[PDB]
Amino acid sequence: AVDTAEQVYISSLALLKMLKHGRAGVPMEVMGLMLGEFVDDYTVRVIDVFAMPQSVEAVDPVFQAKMLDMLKQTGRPEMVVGWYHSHPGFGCWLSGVDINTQQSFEALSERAVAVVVDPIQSVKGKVVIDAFRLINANMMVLGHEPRQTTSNLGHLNKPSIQALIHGLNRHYYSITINYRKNELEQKMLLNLHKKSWMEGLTLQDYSEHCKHNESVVKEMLELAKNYNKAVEEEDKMTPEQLAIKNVGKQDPKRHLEEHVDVLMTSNIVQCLAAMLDTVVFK
Amino acid sequence: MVLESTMVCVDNSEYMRNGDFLPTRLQAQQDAVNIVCHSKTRSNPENNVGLITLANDCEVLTTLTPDTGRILSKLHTVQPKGKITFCTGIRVAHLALKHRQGKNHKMRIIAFVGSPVEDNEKDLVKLAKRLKKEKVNVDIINFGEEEVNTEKLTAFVNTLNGKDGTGSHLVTVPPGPSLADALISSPILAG
Amino acid sequence: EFLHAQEEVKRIQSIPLVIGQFLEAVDQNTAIVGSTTGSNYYVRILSTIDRELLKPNASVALHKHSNALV
Amino acid sequence: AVQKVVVHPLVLLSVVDHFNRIGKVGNQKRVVGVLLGSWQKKVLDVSNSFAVPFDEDDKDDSVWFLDHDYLENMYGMFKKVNARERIVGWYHTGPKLHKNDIAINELMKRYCPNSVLVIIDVKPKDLGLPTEAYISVEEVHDDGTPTSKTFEHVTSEIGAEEAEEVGVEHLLRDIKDTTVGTLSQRITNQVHGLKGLNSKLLDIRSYLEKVATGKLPINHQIIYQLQDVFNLLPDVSLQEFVKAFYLKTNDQMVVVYLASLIRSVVALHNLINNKIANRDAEKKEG
Amino acid sequence: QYEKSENDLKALQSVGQIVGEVLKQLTEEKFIVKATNGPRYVVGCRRQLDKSKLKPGTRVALDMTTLTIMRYLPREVDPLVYN
Numbered sequence: 001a002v003d004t005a006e007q008v009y010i011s012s013l014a015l016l017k018m019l020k021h022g023r024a025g026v027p028m029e030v031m032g033l034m035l036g037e038f039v040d041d042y043t044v045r046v047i048d049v050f051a052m053p054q055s056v057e058a059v060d061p062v063f064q065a066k067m068l069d070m071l072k073q074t075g076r077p078e079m080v081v082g083w084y085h086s087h088p089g090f091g092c093w094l095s096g097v098d099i100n101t102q103q104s105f106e107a108l109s110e111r112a113v114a115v116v117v118d119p120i121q122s123v124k125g126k127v128v129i130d131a132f133r134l135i136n137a138n139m140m141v142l143g144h145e146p147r148q149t150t151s152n153l154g155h156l157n158k159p160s161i162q163a164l165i166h167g168l169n170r171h172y173y174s175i176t177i178n179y180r181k182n183e184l185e186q187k188m189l190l191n192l193h194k195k196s197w198m199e200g201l202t203l204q205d206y207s208e209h210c211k212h213n214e215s216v217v218k219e220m221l222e223l224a225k226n227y228n229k230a231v232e233e234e235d236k237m238t239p240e241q242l243a244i245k246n247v248g249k250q251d252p253k254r255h256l257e258e259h260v261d262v263l264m265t266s267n268i269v270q271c272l273a274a275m276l277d278t279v280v281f282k
Numbered sequence: 283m284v285l286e287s288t289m290v291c292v293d294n295s296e297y298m299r300n301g302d303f304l305p306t307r308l309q310a311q312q313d314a315v316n317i318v319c320h321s322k323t324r325s326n327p328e329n330n331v332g333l334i335t336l337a338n339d340c341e342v343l344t345t346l347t348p349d350t351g352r353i354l355s356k357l358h359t360v361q362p363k364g365k366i367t368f369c370t371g372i373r374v375a376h377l378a379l380k381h382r383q384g385k386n387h388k389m390r391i392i393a394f395v396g397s398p399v400e401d402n403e404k405d406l407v408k409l410a411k412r413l414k415k416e417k418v419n420v421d422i423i424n425f426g427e428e429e430v431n432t433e434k435l436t437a438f439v440n441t442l443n444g445k446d447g448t449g450s451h452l453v454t455v456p457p458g459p460s461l462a463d464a465l466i467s468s469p470i471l472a473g
Numbered sequence: 474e475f476l477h478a479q480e481e482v483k484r485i486q487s488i489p490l491v492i493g494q495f496l497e498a499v500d501q502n503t504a505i506v507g508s509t510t511g512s513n514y515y516v517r518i519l520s521t522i523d524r525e526l527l528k529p530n531a532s533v534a535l536h537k538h539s540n541a542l543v
Numbered sequence: 544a545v546q547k548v549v550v551h552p553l554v555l556l557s558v559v560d561h562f563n564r565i566g567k568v569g570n571q572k573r574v575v576g577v578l579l580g581s582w583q584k585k586v587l588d589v590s591n592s593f594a595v596p597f598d599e600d601d602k603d604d605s606v607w608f609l610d611h612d613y614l615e616n617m618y619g620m621f622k623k624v625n626a627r628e629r630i631v632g633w634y635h636t637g638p639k640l641h642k643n644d645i646a647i648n649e650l651m652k653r654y655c656p657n658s659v660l661v662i663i664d665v666k667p668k669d670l671g672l673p674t675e676a677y678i679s680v681e682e683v684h685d686d687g688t689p690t691s692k693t694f695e696h697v698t699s700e701i702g703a704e705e706a707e708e709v710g711v712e713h714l715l716r717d718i719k720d721t722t723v724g725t726l727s728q729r730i731t732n733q734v735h736g737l738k739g740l741n742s743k744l745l746d747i748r749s750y751l752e753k754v755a756t757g758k759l760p761i762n763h764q765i766i767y768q769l770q771d772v773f774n775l776l777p778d779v780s781l782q783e784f785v786k787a788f789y790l791k792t793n794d795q796m797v798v799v800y801l802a803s804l805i806r807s808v809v810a811l812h813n814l815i816n817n818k819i820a821n822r823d824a825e826k827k828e829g
Numbered sequence: 830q831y832e833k834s835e836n837d838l839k840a841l842q843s844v845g846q847i848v849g850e851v852l853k854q855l856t857e858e859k860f861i862v863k864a865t866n867g868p869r870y871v872v873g874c875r876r877q878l879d880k881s882k883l884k885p886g887t888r889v890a891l892d893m894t895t896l897t898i899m900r901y902l903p904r905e906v907d908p909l910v911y912n
């Protein structure tokens with residue numbers, strides 16, 4: 001018996017169920033169960049996620065047994081592997097009671113996993129997901145992980161400061177997480193932002209189109225007005241004092257490319273679709 | 283104490299609307315439901331009861347469940363109107379019991395048939411061997427005019443438990459509200 | 474990759490920042506702001522902000538911990 | 544009327560997982576679950592969904608089972624956990640909807656005012672928009688149909704939310720994507736559009752040759768309605784329509800001309816800018 | 830008496846809140862508020878505060894730690910008046 005370089009296998013539904021639950025209960029720690037499968041001594045796999053009511057102490061486990069039952073009879077039976085909750089705008093660190101449920105859980109199952117989530121620090125590009133694993137204190141001097149591979153040591157990331165200020169190595173150990181993707185969900189997830197041929201065959205309008213070009217050309221004239229004075233101006237001031245006196249209201253040479261780009265991309269497609277609609281049709 | 287799942291096929295067809303039984307076939311088959319639900323109740327609370335009709339759109343009024351009070355609530359205002367339908371009754375009772383959460387329970391079925399059926403013996407042999415695959419021993423207690431001496435039903439049963447199976451059985455429908463405790467005096471555990 | 478870079482910077486705000494006021498800038502990407510917390514500070518700025526939004530002490534936001542013009 | 548619906552990306556995955564659940568049978572086991580949505584407007588919103596046990600034989604498609612008990616308990620749990628959510632309809636993983644599919648809606652029209660169906664496609668070989676939904680009506684016909692009952696196509700779309708866009712689009716990093724690709728998404732658009740046109744034409748001609756000869760019903764269903772489709776067919780090249788093009792196309796050509804005009808000069812500035820710094824730093828370097 | 834003890838048990842874990850006013854609604858979830866004792870902040874409601882009722886000048890209750898709007902309340906109580 002010894003630790004390893006463990007891996008956290010996920011379920012794509014699990015992530016969304018996380019973020020929607022925590023976001024909906026954003027002003028407080030929202031709790032829930034992590035349901036999955038113990039694939040081996042090395043890696044874990046979560047496939048199902050769900051939560052319960054909380055007014056953090058969960059109420060009647062009669063929801064528990066009936067929930068897992070009806071989840072077994074429809075679909076199949078599975079195994080509870082861990083759990084999760086939120087640290088809204090927090091250091092995604094196991095709170096004092098959060099660790100207090102951990103001696104409760106690891107005593108039940110060995111590889112009981114805590115799951116920290118914050119729907120606050122997560123930007124649309126990247127989410128701040130987290131999960132931890134309690135460690136004993138009796139072995140505070142004795143080694144805890146054999147470290148037989150670089151992956152969970154010098155191959156992952158670097159512990160953050162706001163959670164290292166709480167445990168960072170102590171009272172628990174971090175764990176790596178990845179994403180397994182079925183090809184079935186993968187293909188449909190690939191395509192969810194395309195439209196039908198109607199969109200690709202629309203001709204927006206030439207009254208508001210020509211009205212629009214008539215718009216942008218107008219102020220673009222003024223942008224050229226400013227651009228003449230600015231470019232010819234050229235105080236011999238060194239290439240950085242210009243970069244300190246340009247903060248303000250100064251903006252030639254910037255809008256000029258922009259309006260040209262937009263006026264390009266409009267007129268181009270606007271002509272092209274009209275072309276196709278006549279070549280192809282009749 | 284045995285594990286099973288009772289599936290009853292009540293008859294709300296038109297031909298149940300008569301008095302070959304003393305009060306009415308509705309009260310007769312209803313009371314037989316009273317004795318079957320108490321029977322399985324006293325046998326094993328783990329066992330579960332589900333009912334089905336034989337009307338145009340044969341209905342699962344109660345999903346297979348150990349409680350019987352719901353079935354008793356369903357028995358009232360049963361509205362025995364329509365036409366007796368058999369081959370789709372054993373079918374809807376057939377594909378239903380594969381939706382069971384508990385699989386140790388043996389798929390059992392009892393049917394209350396009290397209207398003239400129009401089935402075929404090749405149909406009862408196909409359905410019979412189909413009931414050989416899952417071994418759904420069904421004991422039907424007929425309540426009213428069913429067929430010529432319950433023909434195509436002892437053939438259905440024997441073609442169900444062929445080669446000395448004797449698990450399914452066929453009752454009779456000529457005198458009245460047979461005390462099913464007397465009908466299953468010896469076959470009290472398995473009719 | 475650069476466009477992926479701009480979006481990932483966005484996590485810094487997350488809303489609860491502070492309401493302060495821009496005061497002045499010393500040089501490129503570093504300025505001074507007097508917060509509504511009564512005190513005044515010397516801070517850096519994000520490269521995302523357009524430099525045309527300055528002048529006459531604009532209403533600005535700042536990080537709680539860092540206290541940077543975001 | 545509902546006239547359109549907004550389905551979120553959670554569902555269309557919370558169905559795929561369950562098709563995966565009983566997906567071991569392989570041959571055929573139609574996945575049916577409960578659809579959950581919002582009484583938003585005439586337009587309707589769809590947020591949640593869950594499953595329910597369902598089986599059906601091969602012949603005589605009248606033998607199918609939806610556990611009303613399981614539906615009652617599990618939706619009781621989903622109401623206890625979310626009163627904001629509520630039942631709106633249902634779905635099935637059928638690539639093409641079946642003749643049996645009307646009896647299901649007709650069954651559970653008692654829970655929802657109209658339990659709208661939802662057809663999803665696990666394998667949308669078509670690269671268009673999958674997972675379209677219908678809502679049944681009655682269209683009793685001159686023929687003498689006692690109840691001409693058939694579903695109705697209703698436009699739908701994919702929902703969106705701040706958090707779910709976050710988590711999903713962070714998951715989209717596994718593949719490359721040019722969503723900011725200037726004047727590229729358009730070209731892709733007309734490509735996939737014309738592809739849909741050709742697919743539809745090949746389909747309608749497949750049907751049309753079949754009905755034309757040998758064996759197919761020759762009903763008055765479409766046969767002249769699609770003729771009226773031929774009725775429009777604008778005769779592009781004619782007298783004054785030329786004045787439609789040449790009086791505007793050159794207009795947009797003028798704007799494009801000016802844009803290139805300034806773009807060239809702007810590009811020309813950097814030549815002086817760097818040709819100054821190069822040699823001026825060189826001569827001072829030496 | 831055991832019932833009273835349970836009452837205090839439940840009463841133990843209730844933390845107060847900050848009192849402030851709503852300056853202006855920046856967006857659907859971005860709000861500009863000011864503490865009564867000084868500076869201002871940018872906050873958000875929870876999900877179901879009925880944000881239509883929030884207007885410039887109203888008074889609201891904020892979370893101490895998360896610092897978000899919870900339970901917008903009526904006008905204030907001016908202790909030179911109740912006496």
Ligand SMILES: [Zn+2]
Pocket residue numbers: 029085086087093094095098
């Ligand atoms: Zn916590």
